[PDB]
Design a protein around this ligand. Sequence first.
Ligand code: 75E
Length: 331
Amino acid sequence: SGPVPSRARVYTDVNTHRPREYWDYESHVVEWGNQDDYQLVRKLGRGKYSEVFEAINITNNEKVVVKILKPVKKKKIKREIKILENLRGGPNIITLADIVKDPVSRTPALVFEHVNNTDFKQLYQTLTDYDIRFYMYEILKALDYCHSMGIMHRDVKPHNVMIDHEHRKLRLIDWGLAEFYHPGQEYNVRVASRYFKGPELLVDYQMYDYSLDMWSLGCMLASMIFRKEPFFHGHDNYDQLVRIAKVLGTEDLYDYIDKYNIELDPRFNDILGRHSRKRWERFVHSENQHLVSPEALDFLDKLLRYDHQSRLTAREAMEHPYFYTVVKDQA
Ligand SMILES: N#Cc1cnn2c(NC3CC3)cc(-c3sccc3-c3ccc(=O)[nH]c3)nc12
């Protein structure tokens, strides 16, 4: 027997109610700017599918970030562009400023708003309890917005969170893995970095939704309050599920597998073993106790659930007691 179908608990049919053009990115026609408006200043990074640079827009003297793409399927470039344009002006969503192509090389490049980022491997270790709640609330604004717009980011991790700590400015970036949610659609499970992959990805459950981003957000929160990066440190995708089972327990995992009639890869049987559900206190010590509170733990618990349907939505998460003071100060 095949797996049991699943539907998003919230924003289920937002794309169905939209005109086709909104989500049918394959038919999207790219609007190109002028490549001569931009001059590369310095390199910021290299990736598997791109090279990133800092640039100057010589028409207005503004600092920008330029992502020059390596060979990528045109439908995937159209997907990222279409999502970026649909999300433009949304809270804490990076702004796509321009799309340019080299006239000779035919190489496409995405031009973004620049964020004066403080690298997370330096910033996070300085963040107070209030900073973690404030920045977690800001990512949640970006997530509730993109989910309400029928989009799952699918790559939520510290590297995709740009923070200008001086101006308390956060942007959720790199929409290259993002997809439109369609009820009944089977998605590719080979998405996200190892440490942030949800149980649905690791067990090969394809009918997932926005709730995937909520697991990732839970992984980030656990690493920040416990000062343990990564929180679930698997040696591969199979061992990644073992690392989660050693914390959440194997009982709720097999209850999750049984509920959705998931065919578990035979490799898993001999590595998963039998594990009890641990108490969050075993990750608490003298150097992280100032970031850990009963509110933080309660919130974290409600994010990290094997059953995607039982995790908090981004809007429910914003309503949690953990954010009461952030909500108060913002009024
Ligand atoms: N989008 C965007 C964006 C805004 N600011 N910003 C900064 N700012 C620091 C230099 C101060 C760095 C990067 C970097 S650094 C290495 C890779 C990337 C990158 C850029 C685009 C993308 O889609 N993924 C990854 N991206 C951005």
